[PDB]
Every structure is written in C-alpha cells, then in structure tokens.
Amino acid sequence: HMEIKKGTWIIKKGFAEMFKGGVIMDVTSAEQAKIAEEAGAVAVMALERVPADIRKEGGVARMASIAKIREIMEAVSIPVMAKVRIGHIAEAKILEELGVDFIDESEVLTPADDRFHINKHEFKVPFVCGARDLGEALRRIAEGAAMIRTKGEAGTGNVVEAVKHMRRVMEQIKQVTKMEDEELVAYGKEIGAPVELLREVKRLGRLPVVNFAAGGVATPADAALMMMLGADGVFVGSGIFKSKDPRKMAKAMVLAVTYWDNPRILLKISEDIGEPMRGLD
Amino acid sequence: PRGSHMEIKKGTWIIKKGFAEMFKGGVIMDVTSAEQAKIAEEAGAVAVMALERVPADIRKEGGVARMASIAKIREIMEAVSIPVMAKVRIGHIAEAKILEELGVDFIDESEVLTPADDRFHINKHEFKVPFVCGARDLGEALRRIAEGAAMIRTKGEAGTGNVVEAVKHMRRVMEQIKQVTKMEDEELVAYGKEIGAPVELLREVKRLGRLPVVNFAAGGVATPADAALMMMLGADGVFVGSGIFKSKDPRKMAKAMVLAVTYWDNPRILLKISEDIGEPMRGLD
Amino acid sequence: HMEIKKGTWIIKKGFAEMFKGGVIMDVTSAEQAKIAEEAGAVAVMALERVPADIRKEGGVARMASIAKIREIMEAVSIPVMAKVRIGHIAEAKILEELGVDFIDESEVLTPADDRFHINKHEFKVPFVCGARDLGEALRRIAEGAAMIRTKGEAGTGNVVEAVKHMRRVMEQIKQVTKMEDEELVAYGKEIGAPVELLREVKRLGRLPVVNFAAGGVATPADAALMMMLGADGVFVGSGIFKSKDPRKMAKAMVLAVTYWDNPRILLKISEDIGEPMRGLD
Amino acid sequence: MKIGVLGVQGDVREHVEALHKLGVETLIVKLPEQLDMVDGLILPGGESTTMIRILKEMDMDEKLVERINNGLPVFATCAGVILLAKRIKQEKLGVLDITVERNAYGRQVESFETFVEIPAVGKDPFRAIFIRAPRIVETGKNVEILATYDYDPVLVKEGNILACTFHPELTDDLRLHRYFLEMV
Amino acid sequence: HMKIGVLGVQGDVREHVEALHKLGVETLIVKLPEQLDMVDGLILPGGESTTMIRILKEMDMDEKLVERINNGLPVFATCAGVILLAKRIKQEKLGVLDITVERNAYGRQVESFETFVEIPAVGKDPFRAIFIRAPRIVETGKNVEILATYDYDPVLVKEGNILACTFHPELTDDLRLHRYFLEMV
Amino acid sequence: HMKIGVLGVQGDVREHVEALHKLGVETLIVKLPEQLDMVDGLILPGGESTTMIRILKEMDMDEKLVERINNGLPVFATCAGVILLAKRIKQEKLGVLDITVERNAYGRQVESFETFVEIPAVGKDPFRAIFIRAPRIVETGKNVEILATYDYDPVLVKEGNILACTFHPELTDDLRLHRYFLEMV
C-alpha cells in the first residue's frame, strides 16, 4: 500500500474507454433501469422525462430530482449518469456529492449559462459534453470533458443530424491528421479550437477522448450506421422506451452496436423489434 | 438616568446604504398574503416583498401592473416583524410618496410593473426610505445609484423559472467591475462614456473593487441549486418571488432556498437540502 | 564538459530577454551600422532600403542581398537581424545558414504566403513577428516566434497605430489575467488564440516572450511613450536615418528608452535632436 | 489570537474588515465545529429570525450557548443582542440577562444616527447608527451599563459578553472593537 | 508467430490491441464463436461484465469459451474479465476462476483511484495500478496463486493458464504485465 | 535587511530582480549615479556591453561605479557584465576585473548552447549553464579564483568581492549562484 490519487485525468478519460462498443440508455424509472441493464446497456442516464417528452411538454428543463436519481442508482449495478443544465455549477456540485458516475452537461436541458460552460477541471467526477464539430468537441475538452458525444436532434427519431455531425467531425480529424504545424495553428483559428489539442489529434489520428453518437437513433440499423460512420458507441434515449416493445428493442440496439459489420446478425436482430417511435420531421 | 440626547439625523446615505448591508447572505421573498409572509418569516427570509400577484401571475394575467393596495400591504406589515418592501412603477413619484408615508421599509422601483415614466426614474434622493433598483449591467446599476438607489438587484426574467438572464447579467456586472478595477483614470473617463455611467462612481468602484451598494441576484431562481449558483457568481443574496409559492411545497422549498444561499459552497449541505423540495414551478421557456 | 544542446526554446526566448530596455535600429550600410552601434543600439536590422523608402519606391519587397547583409554583419559586433517575406521558408533557410542572429518575418515586405506563416519550430535561429493584438501575438508564438513586436504603420512617422496596438495588447493581457478557466477557453475562441498560451499569459501576467513597440517612432518622446505604454523596447527604422542628424537622433532614442520615466533627462536629450522625418499622414 | 464572526447571515464583511484594521486574524463561522476554533465571536447585524433558524437547522445553537457559558467572549450588534436576550416582549439563545423590545423605534424610515457618550472608550463621543434598532427595556443583576441614549441602555456588558443596539461596524470608529479584543 | 485474441463484444478493446502490437504480436478481435479456435491466447478486457455475459450468451460463445479455457487456453482478464471468470460473486458468469469477488467494492466512480503496486514477478519497479470502479477479490481458491496485493486484497492472481487482475494495465504504458502473459503462451 | 541593486541601463533586469525576490532580499534598479550609494550589492546583468558602457558614460556613472567597486562593493556579472568589468578585451570598459576576454567567442546566435557545468562551490548537483553569444575568458589574473570551467575555459571566476560568469543563471530556476553572491555580502 502507498499514496493513492483520485479524480485524475487518466482515471476520468480512462473510465470512459470502458464504454466503447456499448449503448447508454436514458431511463425514467427503476423498472426501465432494470430493462436497460438486462438488455446489456453499459450505463443508464437518469431523467424525469426522455428527450421526446422534453420537447412535447415544454417549460424549463432542469436537473432531475435527487429522489429520481437515487431510485435509479439503487436499481442497477452499472454506472448511472445524470444531466445538468449547461453552465450550472451548483447542479453539478450537488450531483458530484450525490455520487453519480458521470455528469452530462447537455443541451437537451434549458441552458443555465448562455456563454460559458462549467469548468470541469474542478471536479473529480468525469463530464461528457456535446459537439457538432471538431472545433467545439475540442473546446469542450479544453474545459475538462472526458468524453464527447456528437449530437443530433434529441427526441425526433431522425438520425440525419447525428450523421451530419459524425461525418463532419471524422472528416476534420482526418484532414488535421495531415496538416503541417503552420497549417494547424491556422486551422485552429478557423475552427476556433486550441492548437495544443489539434497537435494531439494529429498524432492520435482521432479525438483525444471517447466519441459517442447521439440523437435520433430509433432502430438497430440506425445504431449500426453510427458505428459505420466511426462512433465509439451510441446514446439512445427516446428510441427505446418510446417504441412498442422496449425490452425487445433494447436488446437489439446493444447487439447492433457490437455487430454493426455483420449483415447476417443485423438482419437477425431486425426480424422483429416492434414499432419504432413515429418520430418528428 | 437619561444619558445622551444630542441631535439625531434620519434618512441619510449611511443609514440607507447601511440598512441594506444587513440583508447580505439572505433571501427576500415575494408574498401575496399574511399567511405567506409567515411562511417566509418562519423559513428564515430576511425580508418580504408585498404584492397582489407574483411575477408569474403578472405575466399570465396581463393588464396594467401598479402599486399594491394599501390594505394588502398593511396586512403583510402587520403579519411579520421582518422588513416589508413594496414595489412601485418606474418613475411613479406619487406611489413612492404614498409608500414612504405608509412606513414601508424599502421601496422597489421595479420593471416587473407597468412603467409610469418612459424616460426618467424617481429622484430617490428626495426620500428618507431606501430604494432598490434593477440593472442589467454596470452602466445602469451605476446610473440607478446616481439617482439615489441604496441597493441594486441584477435582474433576469421575472416569473419564468429560468436563471439564464440572471446568470448573464450577474456575470456581466462582475466582469465589468473586475475590468474597471484595473483601469487608469483616462481609461475610466473613456469607459464612462462607453457604458454611460458617471465617472465619479467608476472611480469609486475601482477602489472598493465592487459596487458601492449591495447587489442581489433576481429573476428566475426556482430551486436551491439556482440560488447557490447566483452566490457562486458573486451575488450578495437573492430575491425569490414565483419560485417558492409556485411550487408544490412552498414552506419546504423556502427553507431550502435560505440554506442554499448560506451554504452555497457546501456540496454536502446543498445535496441535503435538495434531497426533497417538492416540484419546482414548471417555468416558461 | 558534457552534452550540449543548441537552438532550444530557453535559448531563443532567452536571447531576446537580453534586448529588453533597448533600441533596435534599421541600417542600410556599414556606415549606418557603426553609427547605430556607437549610439548604443542593442542590435541592427539589415535592409536595402528603410520602411519609408519601401513605401515611396514600390514594387516587390524581398529579402536583402546576401552581400548587403554580410556587409553589416562584418561592420559591428552587436547582433544582426534580417527581414524575410511572410511565409517564405526558403529565404529563412538561407538566412539561418548565413548566420544571421534573428530573423524577422515582417509584413513591411511583400508577403510570400497569403495564409500561412513559417513554421519557426524547425529553425535553430530565433524569429520575431508582428501582432496587432493578443490574438495574433499568441498565434505567432504558437508557430514558434521567440519575440513579438507590436506593429504600427511602418515609415510614416506616426506613432498612432503603435499606440493603439500596444494599448490593445496590454489591455487584453490585463483582462485575461483575471479570467476563470471557462472564460479563458471562451476568450480563446473569441480572439482566436490557443487556450494553452492564454493560461500561460494569465499566470505570468504578461506575454510569454519579449514585446517591442514598432512603427512610427520618430522622436525621443515617441520612444519614451512606447515604454510608458508597457513596451520592453522599440524598433526604429526610418525615424533615425530619415532625420537631419542621425547620429544625434540615435543617441537620444537609446537614452529615451532607458530614461522614459525621467522628465529631466527626456528634456535634456530633446534640447537638440535635429529635424525628425516629416512623416506621412 | 483568532476572532470569529458568525456568518450564517448578516453584515459579516463589515465586521471582518474592522477586525482586520485592528490586525487580528479572523474566521467566518458557519459550521458547529468552527466554534471551537476561535477565542472570540462576533454576532453581527442582520435578521435575528434568520440567524436563529439557520443556527437551529445546523445544530449550532445548543453548542453556541454552552461555549458562551464556558466564558467565550462575545460581541453582539443589534440582531446579536436580540439573539442572546433571555426575554423578548421568538426563539433565542437566552443567555444575556436582559429584556428587549424589537423594532422599538418604528420602521426603517425611523432609523437614525446620533452621537452617544461611551466613557469607557474615550472622551470623544461615538457615532451611533440605529437601524430598526431594538430597545433594552430591562437589564439584569450582573448586566453592566456602558452607555445609554435617551433613558435607554444602548451598550451593556455582562460577563464576557458585550452587546449594543447600534452598528459600530458601519462607522470608522474601531474603539468599540478594541474594547472587545481587550476582553480576550 | 503467435496470434493473441481480444474478446471484443464490448469494452476497451483498442487499448489492449495496441499494447499487444507494441509487443509485436499479431492480434484478432474475437466477436464470433468460430474465432475462439483461431487464437493461442485470449484477453478479456475491461468494460461492463453484465454486457459481456449477455452478448456472450446471446451469441452462443459462453459454453464454448468455458470449454476452450478448461482445455488450457491462456487467458488474461482485467477488471470486468475477472468478474466474468469468477466462480462466486457476492449475476451470470463463466465460472472457471476459483475465487469470490465483490463488485464495485471501492464505491462509485468518484472513488476510482490510481496507486503504485508491487508485482515482484515482473520487476523491482512498482507497477502503476489504475482501479476504476474496481472489484475486490474477497477469497482465493486452492490453486489460485497471488502475484500481487494492495491493502490486504489480492489484485493480481494466477490459477493455471489464467491471469486476472482488478486494475487496468492497458491504460498505462507499462507493457510488463502483458509480456508476463505472452510468456504464458 | 540588505538591499541589492541591479544595474538597469539596459538588459534582462527583470530576470535578476525576480531571482533576488525569490531569495527574499529587497531590490533596487540602479539607473542614476546617486543610486550606487544606496546598495550593498550590485548585479551587472546580461544585455549589450557596448550599450551599457555608452549609457554609463553619458550619465557619468562609470568612474563612480569603478571607485565604488574598488572600495569593495560586491558585484555579480553575467555575460555582458564580465565584458564590462574586464581589464583586457581582444571597446570601452570599466577595467577592474583582472582578466582578458574574447567576445562572441563561440560564434553567432545559432551557436548558442546550454550544457551542464560543475560548480563544486555550490553543490554536487551540476548547474545548468546557458551560453548565449557568450564571451570566453582567455586569461585569468593573479588573484582571480576559478570557481568552474567548461571545455578548458573558466566560465565562473571570483576576484575579491566580484563574481563573474559567462553564462546566464538568471534564465534558469537555479538560485544557487545567486545565494553564493549574497553570501558575499
């Protein structure tokens, strides 16, 4: 036994590496948490109402009630994530103290700060943030984000924006990979990203943290596509519980992300899945 | 044994500015009845604001929002022992005179009420009772003070349950203050022109390193976390109107607000008072 | 004796620290180099024609002739700098090989690259670049610049732009000094500067390299002003040799930068200086 | 020597700044465990009802009382007095043997400033700023009266407790604060 | 040359594959049953044990993985892998490693820590152990050899041709524990 | 407490002032003659020797600086300082340090190098020596004590209350050579 260190970058960035190849599901109850866990979800996201309802309802979307989060924390053994309004330091402090495994400073909730985000370095618990391109993915990381999720349109059942952005990020990464330093510094100005992180992307040939696809995934095929486009995994909220047979759909999602390059299997898990959410377009 | 008994002075700047210093670290609650005043007082509120209908209802309803009825204000004045504040329409000298005569402890020339004057505000120096005004930045906070305001409240969107504007403005004011703190006189005079604020007050801000009066966060606070955030952003305290009585369990929510403003830097405690608070107002967005 | 290292950052950044409190003079001949050196200049800049003539003449302004530079290198013992067109890697390689002490990728010469600058990290010799604000000063540094010079209008005898920019840079630095990380990342996007360097500025309370005033200094008073505004020293090209008595003017400049806060002395060196260049306005 | 300023609510800054002028080190006391870290405690101005509520909700009251009875030097201004009082004509700490009347002079518009004579700190009168001040209608057996205004005790001393109904911290007169440190 | 497999139904498969490549061995990500017969060694990576077992069963790979292991196939398990192999858990499992494990034994993710541990078998220099929501080995069996421990708990065990640890060596640049595994092939 | 002066007519005055502040001593930037009588020690910083001497003469500080030094004033010179104090140079100078120096002895700026040098007098740990267009000490006098050398050349000498080196300790975080100077006061 010797000196131990907690909440360091290697631990935060590392924790997220464990999620690769998996599916993170939004859950509203302890019952859903269990379905999600039985299905093979790698983690659940605690919410009062899924993205699709957040849209339908309206009003100010804030942090979930502690009660609701404890409910879910006690219902499964897999990590539990909770969303907080952008820039809401207080909500995040509360959540960290509650012991949540991963905070999500998401935009599906009514933003608290209109310009700045939470300075995530101050925290011990890892954060995951959204991005529509390499520029903000990189900015979010500069603020401390240990995991990025390329967002689309929450709760619409349409992968189009997710595709758009996943392609965008991947495209830029690829380009940056072949830029000369002087081009890197210039590009940094263009897309408004820190040159230090660009140099990092250039060497790793990828983002310096795990990147998940999110927003609009409503069917196994959608999940597989996201992986075909280069995602490390997917976040599915409305697409599972807003369908006819959630447990059925859920097991299929988990298998599509794993066997995205296996048509035989993709077809097998698609033979029957129920009726995907109708979606908004 | 009489003791001392020399001349006394009332309604002076030290007394007005001073009275407000006593509110620091506290929560001022909007109240519509004597029953609410009592809940607010039991919860630990440092003062109550007398109204006919809270900001959220002011929005929903519509029409011309004026000064509350004297009856309603007396009701509340007699219900608690903590200071009682009353709002008046911007520029409405008469309403303010009436209120001062009524003995209210703090007049609030607020914008949540249908403005009476479209250009000028009340010349608050003429009064003995202190005034509190709104501001969206250092420029107007400073102008309001030049007119006599003894306390400023950085406003957001009244009755919407959204702290976003409050955050925006609190950050804005604090940012500017910080900057002014490191400006050279010639830069001060120039900045004054830019943000339209009196150079004399800028020189004052530059030395104190802060506003020359108490600054409270207001508008959109609907949960303990929100209140704590406002403090994290540099507020001296918060005004909460709709967020408490528009929730499921007001008394419950109220006690939490009071504690969040005090223990904003204590996660353990913030979590404790958050374990249960009921359902915050739905909010408008 | 042991292992030695050359052209490292500490050596480049360091070399420039030695210039603080001094004046760097543009020189066209070996005779001027000597006047400059006798006057107390800390270094000379080799040119075919000073900035004011560069304007008057016209055409494409390039690197000086090797002959002209050798002339000056052999004429004095103080460091000799040479200008190169922006983005002209070849000119810089040639100059480094020639042994010049400091390359100046300046904008007073017809730019060679319209978008990118020279990747200065590849070189052993230090580079000095221009900037009009903290954003580009920081970008230039990210490319390898060991010294920044806040530019104004070359060869016009008008300090106005120099003042404008020196104030601008200093203002921003001051601000950044009191920003919170989340504000730093945001500011970086705004002014297009690398967040890593902003965090550095925030701690040092100043630029991470020497910053000189340049462009339009034509009289001792002008030089003193630049120092009053926070410069580490000044570059004077046209203002000295375009005046009646260069040697006289030169000695005064050197003393103004040193005694900028001494009115008695500033007045003494101003009692007689000759006729400053007429200037263009 | 480290003096504490109870900081659950009130003009904590004003007092902290006074103590700093007197060169002593300070500590804002918010948690119970901090009461055992100071040689003296100042109960600042603010809202008595707020202070007592927080104090109880955080389980600091009973310990504050004990700590005081064990001789901890305390200085109370306005709200502090009401907080310590044994009788009020409202929850309280009940340790200062006096009876107080809240808002005895009227509403805020009634707030006034006058010069009061406090012999114990000098010949020069003290600038007393009474803001919605309380009145001490009855002093106990060991309660020593250090100054009065218009027939009313405005500055009393009982044991290691020093209480006044005005706000010295709003003025630049550090005299009443020295007199307190002299009690430590 | 030898071909080492990395079970890839879910988890930090890349981290391991990259470690093996640094050691110059050829690798194969194992997703289908028929691929278990194509490797000399198998690494059960970090990730979610519940996920791994579910996929493993739904794809009919579990029973064959067990057999294959009992027939002496060299296996290296990190965190999730251990829970997967364990015979007893204080949840479905492969049940081949004779040990009893306690999941999330140190608490939530905020409890995750990194400390230096001494693994004599691989050198004098301590190893950088990164425990992320790690499990605890509360009881080791008869043939279970203990190669290293931290605060009274076995953090690196060896039973037969199985090598299991509760931390993540693949997150560090220390290839030592990976060599030791190849040495078992 | 003692007050050390840093000659500030030109040069890296900040670097030195910051070093002295780390050692907790009070400092004064010396620009005018009358300030030479206000310090217990004086540091002649790096910069341009030709510039320093010119300003020094034009401000009538040279003759008084020389006297003041001969009367035993403790002086610490880095690079330019050495050339300034030197008695012989292979250019105007103060001429008090009994040594002969060769300017730009290693070549142009591209030749500038950093190497570790051993200065026994301040510890066993080598010192990080940064030579930038440094001069070479080609000949030391009778009372000139040699405290350290690099490749056959004295890089740190001591004669009386004068301490001179050809490199820049102020560019590093090693305060050792600066303490050794204060120890001379």
From Swiss-Prot, chains A, C:
Residues reported to bind D-ribulose 5-phosphate: D104
Active site: K83
Keyword match Glycoprotein: no
Gene3D superfamilies the UniProt entry points to: Aldolase class I (3.20.20.70)
Residues where D-glyceraldehyde 3-phosphate binds: R167
Segment forming the signal sequence: none
Molecular function (Gene Ontology), one example: pyridoxal 5'-phosphate synthase (glutamine hydrolysing) activity
Pfam families the record matches: SOR_SNZ (PF01680)
Catalysed reactions, as listed in the record: aldehydo-D-ribose 5-phosphate + D-glyceraldehyde 3-phosphate + L-glutamine = pyridoxal 5'-phosphate + L-glutamate + phosphate + 3 H2O + H(+)
One GO BP: pyridoxal phosphate biosynthetic process
Pathway as given in its UniProt record: Cofactor biosynthesis; pyridoxal 5'-phosphate biosynthesis
Enzyme Commission number(s) of this protein: 4.3.3.6
Enzyme category, top tier: lyase
Key words, A-Z: Lyase, Pyridoxal phosphate, Schiff base
Residues engaged in binding D-ribose 5-phosphate: D26, G155, G216, G237, S238
Entry similarity comment: Belongs to the PdxS/SNZ family.
HAMAP family cross-referenced by the UniProt entry: PdxS
Function in brief: Catalyzes the formation of pyridoxal 5'-phosphate from ribose 5-phosphate (RBP), glyceraldehyde 3-phosphate (G3P) and ammonia. The ammonia is provided by the PdxT subunit. Can also use ribulose 5-phosphate and dihydroxyacetone phosphate as substrates, resulting from enzyme-catalyzed isomerization of RBP and G3P, respectively.
Record-given protein name: Pyridoxal 5'-phosphate synthase subunit PdxS
Provenance organism: Thermotoga maritima (strain ATCC 43589 / DSM 3109 / JCM 10099 / NBRC 100826 / MSB8)
Gene: pdxS
Curated annotation (Swiss-Prot), chain B:
Domain of life: Bacteria
Residues that coordinate or bind D-ribose 5-phosphate: D30, G159, G220, G241, S242
Binding site for D-glyceraldehyde 3-phosphate: R171
GO biological process: one example: pyridoxine biosynthetic process
Gene3D superfamilies: Aldolase class I (3.20.20.70)
Residues that hold D-ribulose 5-phosphate according to the record: D108
Gene Ontology molecular functions: amine-lyase activity; pyridoxal 5'-phosphate synthase (glutamine hydrolysing) activity
Catalysed reactions listed for this entry: aldehydo-D-ribose 5-phosphate + D-glyceraldehyde 3-phosphate + L-glutamine = pyridoxal 5'-phosphate + L-glutamate + phosphate + 3 H2O + H(+)
Keywords from the UniProt entry: Lyase, Pyridoxal phosphate, Schiff base
Similarity comment text for this entry: Belongs to the PdxS/SNZ family.
Cited function: Catalyzes the formation of pyridoxal 5'-phosphate from ribose 5-phosphate (RBP), glyceraldehyde 3-phosphate (G3P) and ammonia. The ammonia is provided by the PdxT subunit. Can also use ribulose 5-phosphate and dihydroxyacetone phosphate as substrates, resulting from enzyme-catalyzed isomerization of RBP and G3P, respectively.
Name the record gives this protein: Pyridoxal 5'-phosphate synthase subunit PdxS
Gene (UniProt): pdxS
Curated annotation (Swiss-Prot), chains E, F:
UniProtKB keywords: Glutamine amidotransferase, Hydrolase, Lyase, Pyridoxal phosphate
CDD domains to which the protein is assigned, alphabetical: GATase1_PB
EC number: 4.3.3.6, 3.5.1.2
Residues binding L-glutamine: G47, E48, S49, R103, I132, R133
Active site: C79, H168, E170
Pfam families cross-referenced by the UniProt entry: SNO
GO MF term list: glutaminase activity; pyridoxal 5'-phosphate synthase (glutamine hydrolysing) activity
Domain of life (superkingdom): Bacteria
GO biological process: glutamine catabolic process; pyridoxal phosphate biosynthetic process; pyridoxine metabolic process
GO CC annotations on file: cytosol; glutaminase complex
Pathway named in the protein's UniProt entry: Cofactor biosynthesis; pyridoxal 5'-phosphate biosynthesis
Keyword Hydrolase included in the entry's annotation: yes
Keyword flag Nucleus: no
Catalytic function, reaction form: aldehydo-D-ribose 5-phosphate + D-glyceraldehyde 3-phosphate + L-glutamine = pyridoxal 5'-phosphate + L-glutamate + phosphate + 3 H2O + H(+); L-glutamine + H2O = L-glutamate + NH4(+)
Disulfide bridge partners, by residue number: none
Primary role: Catalyzes the hydrolysis of glutamine to glutamate and ammonia as part of the biosynthesis of pyridoxal 5'-phosphate. The resulting ammonia molecule is channeled to the active site of PdxS.
Protein family (similarity comment): Belongs to the glutaminase PdxT/SNO family.
Subunit structure: In the presence of PdxS, forms a dodecamer of heterodimers. Only shows activity in the heterodimer.
Name of the protein in question: Pyridoxal 5'-phosphate synthase subunit PdxT
